[PDB]
Amino acid sequence: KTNQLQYMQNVVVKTLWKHQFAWPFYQPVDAIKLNLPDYHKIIKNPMDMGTIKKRLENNYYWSASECMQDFNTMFTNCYIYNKPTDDIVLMAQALEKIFLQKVAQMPQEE
């Protein structure tokens, strides 16, 4: 667990989690409960903040760049599946802005 990775866990994930718009990204999209029976055929690599958080907490990542790619996948999946004025896209967009600002302050490995 590099210090960039502990920053992803202690700073990026924590800051995003507390956001009022973050909760649709806490858990995998459940295509049955939400009646999106095409979701897994369009979105081949599902990702969510809960899975990212678990991977950080259990030292799954080899580098912070893998963690960031999961974040990038999470947001991009949202945009792939949804429409530009959907509430979910506005929520993703607000979260993504904070994400970009927070990883800009990520410390260097030393």
């Binding site: 649709p24 939400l34 999106l36 949804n82 429409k83 959907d86 509430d87 979910i88 929520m91």
Partner: peptide, 6 residues
């Protein structure tokens, strides 16, 4: 998709 999440 997903409706009105506000």
């Amino acid at each position: 998709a997903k409706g009105l999440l506000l």
